[PDB]
Amino acid sequence: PDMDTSFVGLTGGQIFNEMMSRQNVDTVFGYPGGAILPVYDAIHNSDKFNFVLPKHEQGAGHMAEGYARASGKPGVVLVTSGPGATNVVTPMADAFADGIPMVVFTGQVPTSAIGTDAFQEADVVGISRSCTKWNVMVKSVEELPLRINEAFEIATSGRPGPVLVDLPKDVTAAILRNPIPTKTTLPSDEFVMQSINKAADLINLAKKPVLYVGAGILNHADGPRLLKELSDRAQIPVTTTLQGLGSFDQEDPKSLDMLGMHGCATANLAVQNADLIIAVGARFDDRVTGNISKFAPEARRAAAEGRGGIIHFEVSPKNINKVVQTQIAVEGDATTNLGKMMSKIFPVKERSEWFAQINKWKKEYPYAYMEETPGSKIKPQTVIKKLSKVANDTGRHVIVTTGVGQHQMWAAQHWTWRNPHTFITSGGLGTMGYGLPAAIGAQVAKPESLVIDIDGDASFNMTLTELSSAVQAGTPVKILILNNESHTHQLNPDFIKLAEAMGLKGLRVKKQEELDAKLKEFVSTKGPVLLEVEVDKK
């Protein structure tokens, strides 16, 4: 039993700080309260941590999500007992649905008061069970480093996700009197190898392969690089899921852009005509596949003839052969396994016919929307198209968050995606209000990046109180509101006056001819800014 005395004499609060440092955390999103005070005071008073304060705990959660997606690091959330904890249920479920690394620390009533219906107090472990990968209540200060290390390890491994650590006030305020095992203080087969070889064989055999890439490739820093490398080496066209946008440069000649029900027809056609589908960190969602029996007939036929089919690089065993029957499953981290596979891949000089057919499709079936005519209302797709161009022309690194609704899909389709970790949107849970706090967190993660929230009026209304949080945090986020307003009529506030009340510059566009100028002013504006564009209804 190798024992450690280095935390003896410290409070749980300081121990928490040290553990945060060991986990390479320098940013925490949260909101104070009595039960979490011993930890909050330690974090708040240390210049080693940027503590970001929202107006509502839900904001803290969504900020952490945006931070995680932008940085690849886990988002750390620190809230109090009862309502503090219940206010982060939505962001936890959101992170759980989208596979986002998040560690949620919740203050709790003292261990002596558990289950007496004390002031605040909630069965947070019970509430959050189905919306976390794992949760726990820390029972003693001795146990605090162990649970923190476990939480972070679980949150950042397999498919990433939210974990919750319940922290009773008496535990965090207590001083460690006893040495603890050294291990608890430190942060954290040939079938797989056979599968990698076989997948290399199939790829080398394929005449019309397609790479089908999702969010999983983003869960490792080297993911997109190895994806690009495999695509170049074997000359394989690449299509992405909505959550995979950014993982592959859409200006690359081999990009098929987005796959699925709302994707480019060329991408869909490529997939239906491929003899091999190489699925990398993707879930085979029905919005991507459509009717599963009609999906990838050329791949099915190739599998039946033993010359192709489907390869699935998937980290979770439970997702293997859950939707589609695969010929080869490569279990584990996609990036890691792509790296091991690379040297076994035959360098292909060209696939002239395959790319010729693809490029013909690109001519025949581009995206199409009822474009603007003189004197007509502005089309939301046009705003997004123009803004993408304007944003790129800045030469800056650009990150995009969205709310939930038609604008979300339009952003996915009509924006030109070039860099990884630049599309931050609520896909699995579809949480309205996501855009603004996610942008703030993303901006904190990437202070030099231009961060744009493409939002709808209804979604924006959900969390608009966080506008003041953006000013306070010094995050110069660019908020875009595409305002499209029997039916359901919601009374909107004056968004420009609202922004001004919150401390931001506010801009508005009603007519087609003032759009280009305002878009330039919007992006060029220093500090946070809201631009409302009055827009045509679908």
Ligand X SMILES: Cc1ncc(C[n+]2csc(CCOP(=O)(O)OP(=O)(O)O)c2C)c(N)n1
Ligand Y SMILES: CC(=O)c1sc(CCOP(=O)(O)OP(=O)(O)O)c(C)[n+]1Cc1cnc(C)nc1N
Ligand Z SMILES: Cc1cc2nc3c(=O)[nH]c(=O)nc-3n(C[C@H](O)[C@H](O)[C@H](O)COP(=O)(O)OP(=O)(O)OC[C@H]3O[C@@H](n4cnc5c(N)ncnc54)[C@H](O)[C@@H]3O)c2cc1C
Q: Which residues are annotated as a binding site for thiamine diphosphate?
A: 57
Taking the least distance from each CB to K ion, the nearer of 317 and 366 is 366
φ/ψ of residue 56, rounded to 5: -145, 140
Judged by CB under 6 A, the stretch of 102-110, 197-205, 222-230, 397-405 that binds ligand Y is: 397-405
Owner of token pair 């069970």: 129
Closest CA to 227 of 197, 248, 250, 196: 248
409 lies in the binding site for a copy of itself (CB under 8 A): no
Taking the least distance from each CB to K ion, the nearer of 147 and 379 is 379
Binding characters for K ion, 230-269, by CB under 5 A (x = yes):
---------------------------x------------
Neighbouring CB atoms inside 10 A of 198's CB total 15
First to last CA, the chain: 67
Q: In sequence order, what are the residues at sequence separation of 6 or more whose Cβ sits closer than 8 angstroms to the Cβ of residue 327?
A: 202, 303, 308, 309, 310, 311
Judged by CB under 5 A, the stretch of 78-86, 118-126, 161-169, 483-491 that binds Mg ion is: 483-491
Name the binder of 492 from K ion, a copy of itself, Mg ion, none, CB < 5-8 A by kind.
a copy of itself
Which one of residues 403, 427, 506, 528 is an interface residue with ligand X (CB under 6 A)?
Answer: 403
The single-letter code of the amino acid at 348 is V
532 lies in the binding site for ligand Z (CB under 6 A): no
Name the binder of 334 from ligand Z, K ion, Mg ion, none, CB < 5-8 A by kind.
ligand Z
Q: In sequence order, what are the residues at sequence separation of 6 or more whose Cβ sits closer than 8 angstroms to the Cβ of residue 487?
A: none
69 lies in the binding site for ligand Z (CB under 6 A): no
Residue 460 CB, shortest distance to Mg ion, in Å, is 8
Q: b or e along 322-334 (b: 16 or more beta carbons within 10 Å of the residue's beta carbon)?
A: ebbebbbbbbbbb
**Dist. CA 498–CA 325, nearest whole Å:** 52
Which one of residues 10, 258, 310, 458 is an interface residue with ligand Z (CB under 6 A)?
Answer: 258
Return the structure tokens found at 482: 């595409």
Q: Which of residues 366-405 bind ligand Z (CB under 6 A)?
A: 404
Which one of residues 70, 464, 509, 531 is an interface residue with a copy of itself (CB under 8 A)?
Answer: 464
33 lies in the binding site for ligand Y (CB under 6 A): yes
Residue 243 CB, shortest distance to a copy of itself, in Å, is 13
Q: SS3 sequence, 375-421?
A: CCCCCHHHHHHHHHHHHHCCCCCEEEEECCCHHHHHHHHHCCCCCCC
**Dist. CA 32–CA 187, nearest whole Å:** 27
φ/ψ of residue 527, rounded to 5: 85, 175
List of residues contacting ligand Z (CB under 6 A): 98-99, 119, 159, 214-216, 219-220, 241-244, 258-263, 281-283, 285, 287-288, 313-316, 319, 333-334, 404, 408-409, 427-428, 430
